[PDB]
Amino acid sequence: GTTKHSKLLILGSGPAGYTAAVYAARANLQPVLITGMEKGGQLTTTTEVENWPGDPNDLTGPLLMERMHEHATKFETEIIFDHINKVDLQNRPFRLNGDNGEYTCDALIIATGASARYLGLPSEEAFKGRGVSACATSDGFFYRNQKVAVIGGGNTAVEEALYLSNIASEVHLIHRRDGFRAEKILIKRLMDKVENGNIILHTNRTLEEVTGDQMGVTGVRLRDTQNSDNIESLDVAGLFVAIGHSPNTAIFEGQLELENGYIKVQSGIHGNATQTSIPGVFAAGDVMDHIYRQAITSAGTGCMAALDAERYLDGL
Amino acid sequence: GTTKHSKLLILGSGPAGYTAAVYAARANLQPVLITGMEKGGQLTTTTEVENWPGDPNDLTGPLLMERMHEHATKFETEIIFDHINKVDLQNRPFRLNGDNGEYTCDALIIATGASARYLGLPSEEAFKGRGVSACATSDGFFYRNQKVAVIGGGNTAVEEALYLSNIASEVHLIHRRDGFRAEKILIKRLMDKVENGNIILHTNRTLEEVTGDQMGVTGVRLRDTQNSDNIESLDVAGLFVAIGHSPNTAIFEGQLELENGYIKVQSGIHGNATQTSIPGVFAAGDVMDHIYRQAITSAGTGCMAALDAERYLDGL
Numbered sequence: 249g250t251t252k253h254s255k256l257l258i259l260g261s262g263p264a265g266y267t268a269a270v271y272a273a274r275a276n277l278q279p280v281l282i283t284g285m286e287k288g289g290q291l292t293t294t295t296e297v298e299n300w301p302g303d304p305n306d307l308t309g310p311l312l313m314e315r316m317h318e319h320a321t322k323f324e325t326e327i328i329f330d331h332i333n334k335v336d337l338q339n340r341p342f343r344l345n346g347d348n349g350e351y352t353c354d355a356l357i358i359a360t361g362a363s364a365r366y367l368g369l370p371s372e373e374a375f376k377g378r379g380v381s382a383c384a385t386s387d388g389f390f391y392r393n394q395k396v397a398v399i400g401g402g403n404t405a406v407e408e409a410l411y412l413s414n415i416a417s418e419v420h421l422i423h424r425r426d427g428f429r430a431e432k433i434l435i436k437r438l439m440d441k442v443e444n445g446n447i448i449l450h451t452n453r454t455l456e457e458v459t460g461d462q463m464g465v466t467g468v469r470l471r472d473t474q475n476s477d478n479i480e481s482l483d484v485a486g487l488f489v490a491i492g493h494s495p496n497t498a499i500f501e502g503q504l505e506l507e508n509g510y511i512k513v514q515s516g517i518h519g520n521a522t523q524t525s526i527p528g529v530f531a532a533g534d535v536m537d538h539i540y541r542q543a544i545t546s547a548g549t550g551c552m553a554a555l556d557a558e559r560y561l562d563g564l
Numbered sequence: 565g566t567t568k569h570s571k572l573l574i575l576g577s578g579p580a581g582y583t584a585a586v587y588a589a590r591a592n593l594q595p596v597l598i599t600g601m602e603k604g605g606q607l608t609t610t611t612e613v614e615n616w617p618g619d620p621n622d623l624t625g626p627l628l629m630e631r632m633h634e635h636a637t638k639f640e641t642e643i644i645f646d647h648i649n650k651v652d653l654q655n656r657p658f659r660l661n662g663d664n665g666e667y668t669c670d671a672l673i674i675a676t677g678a679s680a681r682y683l684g685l686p687s688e689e690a691f692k693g694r695g696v697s698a699c700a701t702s703d704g705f706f707y708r709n710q711k712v713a714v715i716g717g718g719n720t721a722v723e724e725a726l727y728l729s730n731i732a733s734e735v736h737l738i739h740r741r742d743g744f745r746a747e748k749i750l751i752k753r754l755m756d757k758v759e760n761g762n763i764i765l766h767t768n769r770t771l772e773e774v775t776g777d778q779m780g781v782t783g784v785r786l787r788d789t790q791n792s793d794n795i796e797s798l799d800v801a802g803l804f805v806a807i808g809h810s811p812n813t814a815i816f817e818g819q820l821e822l823e824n825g826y827i828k829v830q831s832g833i834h835g836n837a838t839q840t841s842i843p844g845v846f847a848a849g850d851v852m853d854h855i856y857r858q859a860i861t862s863a864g865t866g867c868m869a870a871l872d873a874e875r876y877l878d879g880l
């Protein structure tokens with residue numbers, strides 16, 4: 249095998265890795281970006297995007313990422329289609345092992361994302377991007393004043409249904425258990441909206457099928473209870489699947505501090521905000537943000553990581 | 565006078581205030597944005613922008629801000645052309661006094677910027693956007709392998725010349741005093757690049773005039789020393805004026821914690837990152853960031869402020 253050294257290596261071709269490459273290339277750092285298997289990242293799995301600021305109309309997730317890729321290659325970012333399976337961050341240079349060879353580098357920006365899980369139903373698959381979504385912040389406004397269902401049982405599902413209750417005429421929260429696995433303040437607010445409002449609870453139910461037409465989702469079929477096969481059909485215009493994300497950090501376990509799988513960064517207002525627990529390794533995007541999880545915040549921390557990486561490489 | 569209450573009020577029409585309005589409007593918060601006197605913010609004072617990710621070619625600061633304004637008004641953000649001159653943040657609702665009336669609100673996003681100061685010379689004015697710049701990160705790459713001058717004497721000037729030394733064939737750092745007012749690590753690195761390289765120092769000199777042609781800057785005329793009227797003419801393709809920024813926070817003095825005039829935010833990786841020292845008041849953009857100071861980081865914290873404001877307003 250091959251070993252290729254780069255002063256700066258970026259892992260990930262989602263908005264954080266591409267923004268980090270355009271800021272690193274205009275800093276004359278000659279970055280190398282490794283795409284991973286999902287070229288373009290999570291935004292290639294959605295259709296219309298209407299919260300990328302400055303793109304009021306006609307943007308989809310694939311066109312934004314095409315534009316980003318064009319932008320990084322205008323500045324001569326070396327793009328490599330590989331995926332990293334093993335890392336050693338405790339010696340210098342850092343060493344990273346991909347399928348197509350070994351990579352070493354003096355500074356590393358990790359922008360590997362935190363992908364949304366789905367139920368795995370073929371009718372859900374059918375409607376992805378036409379009524380089924382895994383991001384309420386992104387897509388909730390398409391359903392303003394319409395009925396919506398959210399499925400899931402942890403923090404993300406209660407957060408998403410809570411967010412959606414301000415936009416949707418009603419929110420149908422679906423879960424298999426007879427309870428939610430969520431933070432206190434989240435459940436208090438949930439019980440408030442259930443009782444004085446907007447959110448309808450459907451505990452002890454599993455989603456059997458998503459129905460719809462040529463245009464999109466029109467319903468969801470549920471089944472069960474504590475002992476029975478009840479079956480409920482809901483009229484709903486959109487389904488938000490909110491069962492959790494998988495931060496792509498298994499390769500970093502035991503090398504970097506993680507907090508529930510997310511990379512912990514130094515953050516703060518005094519600079520070096522994207523530095524991880526190892527000097528010279530920076531993280532950006534959803535891998536280090538389990539709170540906002542948007543393309544624009546990923547591009548902003550991708551910028552910060554490139555400039556933090558430049559200041560580190562220059563001895564500051 | 566008039567008093568207008570809004571659940572959410574955004575101060576500032578730069579990238580952070582406009583992104584906060586498009587995220588707040590799609591959260592169904594019906595935001596009101598007050599433009600301030602500089603409609604569109606600092607980016608209306610520059611020409612080509614080539615580090616807004618996803619816009620590889622043809623973008624200028626005014627077109628990006630036009631696009632942002634279109635984006636916020638597509639979602640029905642109420643835009644008010646006024647400028648706030650007095651605030652009371654210690655009673656609820658918050659009260660803010662503009663020239664065209666009073667505004668109260670339950671949550672406030674402050675995105676008032678930190679504007680770059682210039683020397684005030686008419687030949688510098690002449691060349692703004694055609695060789696004179698106040699942002700090396702933004703514009704340094706236009707001068708790759710060319711001679712550049714930076715003028716200033718604090719942290720910003722040494723940071724900018726240090727950044728530019730990796731891009732420019734040489735960097736001419738100009739200052740009136742026979743020393744820099746900068747951080748230790750910054751001056752150590754500066755003396756390193758002066759001695760083993762790239763940066764040429766011109767202490768005890770003032771900038772007399774910027775020369776150029778139809779296309780742009782071609783030189784700078786300097787004068788003086790410790791006792792004399794020496795006069796030096798430099799051949800340079802670009803001048804970076806780096807004398808400092810003015811965070812627009814005088815109205816907030818004594819109401820919010822400030823750090824050298826910048827609004828301090830809670831930051832961190834557990835959410836509520838844009839909250840100031842007062843619950844319900846959030847800050848975004850260059851007013852709370854004296855480290856990166858880019859449009860994309862301002863848009864990212866403008867996003868975070870809108871979602872933090874939404875979670876606060878919903879009792880979380």
Ligand SMILES: Cc1cc2nc3c(=O)[nH]c(=O)nc-3n(C[C@H](O)[C@H](O)[C@H](O)COP(=O)(O)OP(=O)(O)OC[C@H]3O[C@@H](n4cnc5c(N)ncnc54)[C@H](O)[C@@H]3O)c2cc1C
Pocket residue numbers: 259260261262263264265282283284285286287288289290291293294296297298299300330331332333359360361362363364381382383386387496499532533534535541542543544546
């Ligand atoms: C269905 C859906 C709709 C959404 N819609 C929107 C929207 O309208 N607007 C919005 O603002 N946000 C939206 N989001 C959120 C947005 O997708 C993410 O916030 C953003 O994509 C995260 O960017 P990122 O660069 O951190 O990571 P990602 O886009 O997740 O990209 C991660 C990159 O890391 C690579 N990678 C993974 N592991 C490795 C490895 N071991 N080696 C090398 N590379 C690796 C992958 O190939 C990938 O390219 C949506 C998300 C979902 C789930």
Ligand SMILES: Cc1cc2nc3c(=O)[nH]c(=O)nc-3n(C[C@H](O)[C@H](O)[C@H](O)COP(=O)(O)OP(=O)(O)OC[C@H]3O[C@@H](n4cnc5c(N)ncnc54)[C@H](O)[C@@H]3O)c2cc1C
Pocket residue numbers: 575576577578579580581598599600601602603604605606607609610612613614615616646647648649675676677678679680697698699702703812815848849850851857858859860862
């Ligand atoms: C010459 C120059 C070139 C630059 N080029 C680039 C570039 O190519 N790319 C890039 O990424 N960044 C660039 N930047 C940096 C970029 O301009 C800033 O990072 C960004 O504009 C900051 O956004 P903001 O929203 O925080 O504030 P600003 O854009 O500064 O806007 C502040 C807003 O607050 C308003 N305001 C002020 N006080 C009040 C008040 N009392 N009441 C109400 N409103 C008020 C103002 O009217 C204004 O609209 C450049 C900066 C300069 C100086």
